[PDB]
Amino acid sequence: DPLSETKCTLKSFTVEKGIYQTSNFRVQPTESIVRFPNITNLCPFDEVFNATRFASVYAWNRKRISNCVADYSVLYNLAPFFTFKCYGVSPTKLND
Amino acid sequence: KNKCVNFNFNGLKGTGVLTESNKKFLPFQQFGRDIADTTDAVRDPQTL
Amino acid sequence: FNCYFPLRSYSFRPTYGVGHQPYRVVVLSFELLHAPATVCGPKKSTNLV
Amino acid sequence: LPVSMTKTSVDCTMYICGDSTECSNLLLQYGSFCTQLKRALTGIAVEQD
Amino acid sequence: LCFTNVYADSFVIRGDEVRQIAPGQTGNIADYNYKLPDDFTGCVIAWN
Amino acid sequence: SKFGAISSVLNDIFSRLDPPEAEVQIDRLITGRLQSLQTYVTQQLIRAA
Ligand SMILES: *[C@@H]1O[C@H](CO)[C@@H](O)[C@H](O)[C@H]1NC(C)=O
């Protein structure tokens, strides 16, 4: 009851005459929506990681990765992938 | 539209009611932020 | 498109690398709130003043 | 000569937490900060009236 | 330090997946098979 | 203002950082906003007097 909420707010069973602000109204959502772009194609994350030969320290190669559906869950499930340290990002919430 | 829903639009999570705007956006823009980084407007990546 | 027996074997093989070798581990579970006296350490007692 | 001011009231959930649910769970671990601030502006609003 | 009681959950896993038996992560054996809450307190006895 | 945290919005740091790390930056933003709300009423209490 709204009268019982005044007894919990002021912490007293005998509530005197007056006006009291107990709580605030808030309409909670009933549905849940998510929108992602219409792409489906996979991009060469596998080719950059599992290439045959690699570049040296100087003149490093940089692959432009854009317009794909990324999927990191196929990356860090590999057996020689020992360490995985991230910066400003948690390693588990990478797919979202 | 026209109901308060939990929206997750390209990583921006939150709660609010969405309605069709009358705003004249330029095509290079994709987001409209109000006073003090308030997410006032958004463009969906599907039908734009 | 999705079909295997749900319980899969670990495929025990000693030639694996050390970062994926089978290691038998047991975990413990102890609560950290107000404890009734059931599990205590080796501390002795002293008379009450 | 001024007599009164603009009476105001501020909420904590829509200001600090905004639209997040996880912020409302952690803010109750802080005590009675928002009960102090709501009664103070209420005590202001009855004073200027 | 005193506690209420101490348990022992015996299982076998391999070397690559020892980190996600911990409060607040995800995984193949963490999500659907063996999970533990966000306020868990315990030690891993990992011998060779 | 970010108050020295990663971002000014709090919904994304709950979505980007893990809860072992994300409540550290949330407690930075909560104590920054609770100090912002406490000082605002305190300047109001001097002005209302
Ligand atoms: C995304 O693809 C769908 C395919 O049905 C199309 O209807 C929609 O217009 C596309 N959106 C773009 C290209 O922004």
Side-chain angles (χ1 to χ4, degrees), chain A residues 1-25 27-29 31-38 40-62 65-96, chain B residues 1-19 21 23 25-29 31-33 35-36 39-45 47-48, chain C residues 1 3-14 16-30 32-37 39-42 45-49, chain D residues 1-13 15-49, chain E residues 1-15 17-25 27-37 39-48, chain F:
Chain A
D1 292 328
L3 172 63
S4 279
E5 185 166 10
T6 76
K7 304 152 111 163
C8 279
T9 299
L10 321 173
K11 284 162 181 23
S12 48
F13 274 75
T14 43
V15 170
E16 322 206 350
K17 180 188 63 180
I19 175 165
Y20 304 110
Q21 324 164 20
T22 70
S23 159
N24 294 48
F25 187 42
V27 172
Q28 313 274 340
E31 271 155 359
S32 165
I33 189 176
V34 54
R35 292 280 260 181
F36 271 59
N38 49 16
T40 321
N41 55 326
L42 261 63
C43 61
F45 259 89
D46 193 286
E47 184 215 330
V48 172
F49 269 74
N50 291 332
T52 78
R53 215 81 181 171
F54 269 51
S56 45
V57 176
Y58 84 110
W60 40 268
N61 188 359
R62 175 191 281 240
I65 299 193
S66 160
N67 313 316
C68 64
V69 171
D71 185 19
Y72 300 96
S73 44
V74 70
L75 172 149
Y76 68 109
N77 61 355
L78 196 69
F81 270 26
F82 299 158
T83 182
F84 195 12
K85 175 202 310 173
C86 310
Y87 292 147
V89 165
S90 65
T92 76
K93 316 212 162 273
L94 208 51
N95 313 306
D96 313 277
Chain B
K1 303 203 221 153
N2 303 57
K3 312 154 53 54
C4 196
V5 309
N6 263 327
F7 62 96
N8 181 349
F9 285 173
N10 312 336
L12 172 74
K13 314 174 45 55
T15 317
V17 52
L18 311 163
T19 175
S21 301
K23 276 151 142 74
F25 282 179
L26 301 163
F28 64 94
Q29 296 165 325
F31 204 98
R33 264 202 280 201
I35 295 99
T39 76
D40 192 354
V42 75
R43 174 201 291 296
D44 61 66
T47 177
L48 301 183
Chain C
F1 183 100
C3 200
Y4 312 92
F5 206 60
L7 297 167
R8 276 152 282 271
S9 199
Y10 277 133
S11 306
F12 289 105
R13 173 65 259 194
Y16 266 52
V18 286
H20 200 179
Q21 273 273 348
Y23 270 80
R24 280 149 79 108
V25 57
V26 70
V27 304
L28 320 173
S29 195
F30 45 90
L32 215 53
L33 81 173
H34 287 171
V39 194
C40 82
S45 301
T46 319
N47 187 285
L48 191 52
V49 198
Chain D
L1 261 183
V3 180
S4 87
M5 62 165 38
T6 317
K7 315 154 43 192
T8 174
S9 278
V10 67
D11 195 8
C12 284
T13 317
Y15 178 74
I16 298 184
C17 304
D19 43 358
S20 159
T21 301
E22 323 283 356
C23 175
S24 315
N25 304 357
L26 309 192
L27 175 54
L28 319 182
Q29 293 193 190
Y30 272 81
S32 45
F33 267 92
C34 295
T35 81
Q36 273 174 339
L37 293 172
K38 175 171 52 63
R39 292 189 320 88
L41 301 153
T42 299
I44 280 176
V46 307
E47 176 205 296
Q48 312 274 320
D49 282 7
Chain E
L1 175 47
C2 182
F3 323 103
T4 45
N5 42 16
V6 53
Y7 298 106
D9 306 0
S10 163
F11 60 77
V12 191
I13 48 155
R14 308 154 67 60
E17 65 265 350
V18 198
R19 294 296 307 98
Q20 76 283 329
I21 42 183
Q25 289 82 16
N28 56 38
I29 52 177
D31 195 295
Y32 289 85
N33 314 106
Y34 185 107
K35 73 180 294 184
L36 79 172
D39 311 328
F40 195 86
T41 316
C43 185
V44 299
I45 310 193
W47 71 98
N48 186 208
Chain F
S1 158
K2 315 192 191 263
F3 264 110
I6 310 298
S7 279
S8 171
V9 195
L10 84 172
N11 264 327
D12 57 49
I13 55 185
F14 272 121
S15 159
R16 287 162 43 180
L17 310 192
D18 41 356
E21 184 42 34
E23 319 168 39
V24 173
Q25 315 266 320
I26 282 300
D27 264 358
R28 174 141 81 221
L29 269 181
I30 283 180
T31 51
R33 274 151 191 191
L34 265 178
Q35 210 174 336
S36 177
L37 211 53
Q38 183 93 10
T39 305
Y40 153 74
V41 186
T42 301
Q43 300 252 9
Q44 193 94 340
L45 278 168
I46 299 174
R47 194 190 339 269

